Design an enzyme around this catalytic site. Structure first.
Site, mmCIF file in Angstrom:
data_model
loop_
_atom_site.group_PDB
_atom_site.id
_atom_site.type_symbol
_atom_site.label_atom_id
_atom_site.label_comp_id
_atom_site.label_asym_id
_atom_site.label_seq_id
_atom_site.Cartn_x
_atom_site.Cartn_y
_atom_site.Cartn_z
ATOM 1 N N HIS A 16 69.273 40.854 2.834
ATOM 2 C CA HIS A 16 70.034 39.777 2.181
ATOM 3 C C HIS A 16 70.967 39.132 3.214
ATOM 4 C CE1 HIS A 16 73.204 37.928 -0.108
ATOM 5 N NE2 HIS A 16 72.288 37.774 -1.105
ATOM 6 N N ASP A 18 74.028 37.801 3.282
ATOM 7 C CA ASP A 18 75.413 38.332 3.339
ATOM 8 C C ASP A 18 75.399 39.758 3.924
ATOM 9 O OD1 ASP A 18 76.811 36.114 2.179
ATOM 10 O OD2 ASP A 18 76.518 36.925 0.138
ATOM 11 N N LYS A 19 74.459 40.595 3.509
ATOM 12 C CA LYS A 19 74.424 41.988 4.017
ATOM 13 C C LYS A 19 74.071 41.973 5.512
ATOM 14 C CE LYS A 19 76.169 44.964 1.404
ATOM 15 N NZ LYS A 19 77.129 45.183 2.533
ATOM 16 N N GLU A 44 84.191 38.885 11.896
ATOM 17 C CA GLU A 44 83.477 38.175 10.837
ATOM 18 C C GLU A 44 82.161 37.667 11.368
ATOM 19 O OE1 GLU A 44 84.992 38.828 8.247
ATOM 20 O OE2 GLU A 44 87.173 38.340 8.288
ATOM 21 N N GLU A 57 88.863 38.464 15.641
ATOM 22 C CA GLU A 57 89.851 39.025 16.573
ATOM 23 C C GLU A 57 89.419 40.404 17.042
ATOM 24 O OE1 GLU A 57 91.048 38.277 13.323
ATOM 25 O OE2 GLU A 57 90.994 36.148 13.817
ATOM 26 N N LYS A 170 66.962 41.485 -3.826
ATOM 27 C CA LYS A 170 68.071 41.837 -4.752
ATOM 28 C C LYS A 170 67.552 42.601 -5.962
ATOM 29 C CE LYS A 170 71.254 38.678 -5.205
ATOM 30 N NZ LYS A 170 71.983 37.437 -5.553
ATOM 31 N N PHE A 239 59.434 33.100 -4.177
ATOM 32 C CA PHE A 239 60.528 33.491 -3.252
ATOM 33 C C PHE A 239 59.886 33.708 -1.870
ATOM 34 C CE2 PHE A 239 64.290 36.796 -3.124
ATOM 35 C CZ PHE A 239 64.733 36.264 -1.933
ATOM 36 N N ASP A 247 69.522 30.836 2.195
ATOM 37 C CA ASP A 247 70.873 31.051 1.645
ATOM 38 C C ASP A 247 71.817 31.474 2.761
ATOM 39 O OD1 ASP A 247 72.892 31.443 -0.426
ATOM 40 O OD2 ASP A 247 72.339 33.586 -0.396
ATOM 41 N N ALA A 248 72.930 30.760 2.928
ATOM 42 C CA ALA A 248 73.941 31.105 3.941
ATOM 43 C C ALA A 248 74.510 32.479 3.638
ATOM 44 C CB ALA A 248 75.028 30.081 3.992
ATOM 45 N N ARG A 253 81.129 39.392 1.479
ATOM 46 C CA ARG A 253 80.735 38.663 0.229
ATOM 47 C C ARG A 253 79.918 39.569 -0.706
ATOM 48 N NH1 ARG A 253 81.202 32.945 0.229
ATOM 49 N NH2 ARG A 253 79.702 33.069 -1.492
ATOM 50 N N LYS A 254 79.939 40.884 -0.456
ATOM 51 C CA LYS A 254 79.250 41.868 -1.301
ATOM 52 C C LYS A 254 80.171 43.071 -1.567
ATOM 53 C CE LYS A 254 75.550 39.592 -2.143
ATOM 54 N NZ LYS A 254 76.475 38.471 -2.369
ATOM 55 N N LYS A 274 85.869 45.795 10.492
ATOM 56 C CA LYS A 274 87.291 46.164 10.610
ATOM 57 C C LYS A 274 87.453 47.594 11.145
ATOM 58 C CE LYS A 274 88.592 43.181 6.681
ATOM 59 N NZ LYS A 274 89.091 43.233 5.289
ATOM 60 N N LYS A 278 92.952 48.626 9.607
ATOM 61 C CA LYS A 278 92.816 47.749 8.424
ATOM 62 C C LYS A 278 92.667 48.692 7.228
ATOM 63 C CE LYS A 278 92.038 44.690 11.799
ATOM 64 N NZ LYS A 278 92.412 44.960 13.206
ATOM 65 N N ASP A 280 92.286 47.994 4.294
ATOM 66 C CA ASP A 280 91.219 47.581 3.349
ATOM 67 C C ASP A 280 90.108 48.620 3.429
ATOM 68 O OD1 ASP A 280 92.215 45.136 2.339
ATOM 69 O OD2 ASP A 280 91.499 44.075 4.149
HETATM 70 C C1 LIG Z 1 69.557 32.343 -5.149
HETATM 71 S S1 LIG Z 1 70.374 32.245 -3.545
HETATM 72 C C2 LIG Z 1 72.063 31.613 -4.051
HETATM 73 C C3 LIG Z 1 72.270 30.107 -4.383
HETATM 74 C C4 LIG Z 1 71.824 29.231 -3.204
HETATM 75 N N1 LIG Z 1 72.844 29.232 -2.127
HETATM 76 C C5 LIG Z 1 71.513 27.784 -3.613
HETATM 77 O O1 LIG Z 1 71.445 26.945 -2.676
HETATM 78 O O2 LIG Z 1 71.202 27.560 -4.786
HETATM 79 C C6 LIG Z 1 71.057 33.891 -3.469
HETATM 80 C C7 LIG Z 1 70.111 34.969 -3.038
HETATM 81 O O3 LIG Z 1 68.987 34.947 -3.945
HETATM 82 C C8 LIG Z 1 67.821 35.273 -3.220
HETATM 83 N N2 LIG Z 1 66.883 34.160 -3.300
HETATM 84 C C9 LIG Z 1 66.630 33.211 -2.325
HETATM 85 N N3 LIG Z 1 65.663 32.392 -2.663
HETATM 86 C C10 LIG Z 1 65.214 32.856 -3.895
HETATM 87 C C11 LIG Z 1 64.161 32.464 -4.736
HETATM 88 N N4 LIG Z 1 63.312 31.468 -4.477
HETATM 89 N N5 LIG Z 1 63.975 33.197 -5.867
HETATM 90 C C12 LIG Z 1 64.783 34.232 -6.136
HETATM 91 N N6 LIG Z 1 65.822 34.687 -5.439
HETATM 92 C C13 LIG Z 1 65.953 33.958 -4.303
HETATM 93 C C14 LIG Z 1 68.271 35.670 -1.796
HETATM 94 O O4 LIG Z 1 68.556 37.061 -1.822
HETATM 95 C C15 LIG Z 1 69.541 34.839 -1.641
HETATM 96 O O5 LIG Z 1 70.374 35.357 -0.602
HETATM 97 C C1 LIG Z 2 97.318 40.483 9.178
HETATM 98 S S1 LIG Z 2 95.981 39.266 9.306
HETATM 99 C C2 LIG Z 2 94.489 40.387 9.095
HETATM 100 C C3 LIG Z 2 94.053 41.272 10.275
HETATM 101 C C4 LIG Z 2 93.764 40.426 11.512
HETATM 102 N N1 LIG Z 2 92.443 39.757 11.352
HETATM 103 C C5 LIG Z 2 93.793 41.259 12.800
HETATM 104 O O1 LIG Z 2 93.232 40.750 13.773
HETATM 105 O O2 LIG Z 2 94.450 42.316 12.824
HETATM 106 C C6 LIG Z 2 95.769 38.762 7.601
HETATM 107 C C7 LIG Z 2 96.748 37.723 7.127
HETATM 108 O O3 LIG Z 2 98.086 38.230 7.310
HETATM 109 C C8 LIG Z 2 98.925 37.151 7.659
HETATM 110 N N2 LIG Z 2 99.461 37.347 9.009
HETATM 111 C C9 LIG Z 2 99.055 36.774 10.188
HETATM 112 N N3 LIG Z 2 99.812 37.098 11.195
HETATM 113 C C10 LIG Z 2 100.797 37.923 10.650
HETATM 114 C C11 LIG Z 2 101.925 38.560 11.190
HETATM 115 N N4 LIG Z 2 102.306 38.444 12.462
HETATM 116 N N5 LIG Z 2 102.738 39.215 10.321
HETATM 117 C C12 LIG Z 2 102.394 39.297 9.023
HETATM 118 N N6 LIG Z 2 101.341 38.769 8.413
HETATM 119 C C13 LIG Z 2 100.592 38.069 9.294
HETATM 120 C C14 LIG Z 2 98.100 35.856 7.512
HETATM 121 O O4 LIG Z 2 98.189 35.438 6.159
HETATM 122 C C15 LIG Z 2 96.697 36.361 7.813
HETATM 123 O O5 LIG Z 2 95.709 35.499 7.259
HETATM 124 K K LIG Z 3 89.860 37.739 8.657
HETATM 125 K K LIG Z 4 75.581 31.680 0.016
HETATM 126 MG MG LIG Z 5 90.525 37.488 5.019
HETATM 127 MG MG LIG Z 6 76.348 35.183 -0.956
HETATM 128 MG MG LIG Z 7 76.130 37.199 -5.885
HETATM 129 MG MG LIG Z 8 93.142 41.095 2.086
#
Ligand SMILES: C[S@@+](CC[C@H](N)C(=O)[O-])C[C@H]1O[C@@H](n2cnc3c(N)ncnc32)[C@H](O)[C@@H]1O
Ligand SMILES: C[S@@+](CC[C@H](N)C(=O)[O-])C[C@H]1O[C@@H](n2cnc3c(N)ncnc32)[C@H](O)[C@@H]1O
Ligand SMILES: [K+]
Ligand SMILES: [K+]
Ligand SMILES: [Mg+2]
Ligand SMILES: [Mg+2]
Ligand SMILES: [Mg+2]
Ligand SMILES: [Mg+2]
Lengths: 392, 395
Positions: A16, A18-19, A44, A57, A170, A239, A247-248, A253-254, A274, A278, A280
């Site tokens: 997928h 996103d995965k 990211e 970062e 999926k 499909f 699909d981007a 996102r999961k 991460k 972090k 999270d």
């Molecule tokens: C359906 S697409 C999401 C919406 C899409 N971004 C759009 O442009 O409508 C989400 C996921 O569904 C699956 N997908 C892609 N094409 C598909 C198709 N023809 N039939 C069913 N699932 C599909 C893939 O896993 C994809 O990442």
């Molecule tokens: C702390 S950063 C997340 C981790 C980061 N990507 C890293 O490289 O460690 C997440 C959010 O915290 C906030 N942030 C950024 N710089 C910060 C700082 N110096 N002190 C506190 N919060 C901060 C901003 O809202 C940012 O989008």
């Molecule tokens: K981030």
């Molecule tokens: K998408």
């Molecule tokens: Mg974020």
């Molecule tokens: Mg997605």
């Molecule tokens: Mg979904």
């Molecule tokens: Mg957060």
């Protein structure tokens, strides 16, 4: 008649889009940690037709090849031609990676000078852990079945059982549940859905047959399937286009597929890409360990644990335990035992769960098929801790 | 009185992830203004000196994606490298293609399916939640964090706190009591704010100004006491911010967009998606259902799940739970919900007027939460009357 309700969880497999991003992000983390365990990583990834970008970062002593990590990850998943929705050797790899903000670095880790007990949370936020006695891995059945069906869908492509498959798929499982005094007791599988990418060689009847016989029936225990179970098998009817062509994709996102399939709760933070400062990631992993330990020690049939943090502060801002009325001792007592047993400070969680160890795919393995309910020893947060309590 | 602590956070419109949600929905708004039937799946990402929009758009609209990006950044306050992104100098990358034809044929028949036959745009599941603990039928922890972040933006724009920069985050820990499944706030236990700032202000001044101008105006006095803990810019320095400080992506604030960890979440993001994406239309209808259950007096709290399969109009499952607060059985509430709400996506789209964009219709949803808002564009916040036999009446 027994009162029941319907609860649905989904999953996606490693192809997928996103995965794919989660796995590339964790492949970057793994590569950094293998050379430099103290790497600060916030990687990211995103993808669209013939493009992958890694951005965010990284502060590391490692020498990394971002392009090769992208291509290698794509190749293992099976993205080796335009016909399957991305070619590892054609796609354009963009990079926008900078060192961590010095303003963050000074407050979180003192530019690599704070001792483990003094490391601040890498960010604010909140995280939940969950466990339930309804499966041996102490995870919700709807989640476990959707996840294991998607893993099997990948396996039958790679092992040549279903040669028509393409990487992107999926799954979704609706379980009919009974509430036993707050504990969840699966009754049956009400609905199973699979949508999987495929080539032009296979009919929809063949897809449906092969999905039921090779993918679903091997995974769902027979006791949960009956003649009334509803099957949706490639309901879109075509499909062929898939992966980032269809699909981007983006990292993080999961996050419900990564956790409990809608059970328990989620605080919103993504895991992949991460390092363990972090919270999270490290905080979610520790509260899984806590919730799982409460249930595995027999203290409750189900447990939810929340923790929350402030950037730069080692100690959590709050902790919550709820057992859904299933605890054998009061939840306040369980909270006390959890707070005596688990160290929620990030520098401590990092060492106690060995989270600075990368390589041999340590984190990449977490980035498909769920972070929880996995018996691989690299999933250190699945090890149950003994808890001291007096069973009434 | 046994209590527990529950925490929710928020971010304001200058957070880099929220900037992406707003760009995504600015793109959706622009498409829909000209072509209400636009198919839109617009993702955004950002990092130092860069915004990329990418994904799938099928529209008749005459659109300049770069202009929409730059206009949205500029309006939020990203007008210089000093504040974390320069709307006018940054790179704008675009990787936007038409919707897959394989998806288009199964979902909408290449713009030929009638509304009742429109398939779900994807599989997935969605939850709606309501609670009587606030007038807007939302959790207090979420409402307070969200309103504090909105006020944090307001005091920068109105000149109350001139040292502020656009990127800020909030977090509120509420001490709660369980009253037979209903959530009763007792007090605010902890408030946190981290906000971007310039070099002109001391940490003592930041702490003072955040408490006096941002927190105390928002949190009801009855919830604050001399034991409430304040963390105010705990990192000690937040001068670098926005995309310079942290990469952003669309759909990375889905709990901040919804219920702050209360209820449940099925994982689907909202921003950048047209209403055939049931991640958005389905979540909006199940908020309307849960809110209607509580507002009609049928329960103090309610959770509703719906789920879908791509190409199938009818949901695969529906669940209602009232946490033991329902005044009729949950199975009867489920029946009423199913009789009252049409969960088919072509129907949800029309019933909630979701093909109307422009005048910032969807951009306004992409910061400060999709729920608990009284702006009439938030059509899913309108309570539906429900037909039921109230236990306290004979008639
Ligand atoms: C359906 S697409 C999401 C919406 C899409 N971004 C759009 O442009 O409508 C989400 C996921 O569904 C699956 N997908 C892609 N094409 C598909 C198709 N023809 N039939 C069913 N699932 C599909 C893939 O896993 C994809 O990442
Ligand atoms: C702390 S950063 C997340 C981790 C980061 N990507 C890293 O490289 O460690 C997440 C959010 O915290 C906030 N942030 C950024 N710089 C910060 C700082 N110096 N002190 C506190 N919060 C901060 C901003 O809202 C940012 O989008
Ligand atoms: K981030
Ligand atoms: K998408
Ligand atoms: Mg974020
Ligand atoms: Mg997605
Ligand atoms: Mg979904
Ligand atoms: Mg957060």
């Amino acid at each position: 008649a027994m009162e029941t309700f319907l609860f649905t969880s989904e999953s996606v497999n490693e192809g997928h889009p996103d995965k794919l991003c989660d796995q590339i992000s964790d492949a970057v983390l793994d590569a950094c940690l293998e050379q430099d365990p103290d790497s600060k990583v916030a990687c990211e990834t995103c993808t669209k037709t013939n493009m992958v970008m890694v951005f965010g970062e990284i502060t590391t002593k490692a020498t990394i090849d971002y392009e090769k990590i992208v291509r290698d990850t794509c190749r293992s998943i099976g993205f080796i031609s335009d016909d399957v929705g991305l070619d590892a050797d054609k796609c354009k790899v963009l990079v926008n990676i900078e060192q961590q903000s010095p303003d963050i670095a000074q407050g979180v880790h003192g530019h690599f000078t704070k001792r483990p007990e003094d490391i601040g949370a890498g960010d604010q936020g909140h995280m939940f852990g969950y466990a339930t006695d309804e499966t041996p891995e102490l995870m919700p059945l709807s989640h476990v079945l959707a996840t294991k069906i998607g893993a099997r869908l990948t396996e039958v492509r790679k092992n040549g059982t279903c040669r028509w498959l393409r990487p992107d798929g999926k799954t979704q499982v609706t379980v009919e549940y009974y509430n036993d005094n707050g504990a969840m007791v699966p009754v049956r599988v009400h609905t199973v859905l699979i949508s999987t990418q495929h080539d032009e060689t296979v009919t929809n009847d063949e897809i449906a047959r092969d999905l039921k016989e090779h993918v679903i029936k091997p995974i769902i225990p027979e006791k949960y399937l009956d003649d009334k179970t509803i099957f949706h098998l490639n309901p879109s009817g075509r499909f062929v286009i898939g992966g980032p062509h269809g699909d981007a994709g983006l990292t993080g996102r999961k996050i419900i597929i990564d956790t409990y399939g809608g059970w328990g709760a989620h605080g919103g933070g993504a895991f992949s890409g991460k390092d363990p400062t972090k919270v999270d990631r490290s905080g979610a992993y520790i509260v899984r360990q806590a919730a799982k330990s409460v249930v595995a020690n027999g203290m409750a049939r189900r447990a939810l644990v929340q923790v929350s943090y402030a950037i730069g502060v080692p100690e959590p801002l709050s902790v919550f335990v709820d057992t859904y009325g299933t605890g054998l001792i009061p939840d306040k007592e369980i909270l006390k035992i959890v707070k005596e047993t688990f160290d929620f400070r990030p520098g401590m969680m990092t060492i106690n769960l060995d989270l600075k160890r990368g390589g041999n795919g340590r984190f990449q393995k977490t980035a498909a098929y769920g972070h929880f309910g996995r018996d691989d020893p690299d999933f250190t947060w699945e090890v149950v801790k003994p808890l001291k309590w007096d069973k009434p």
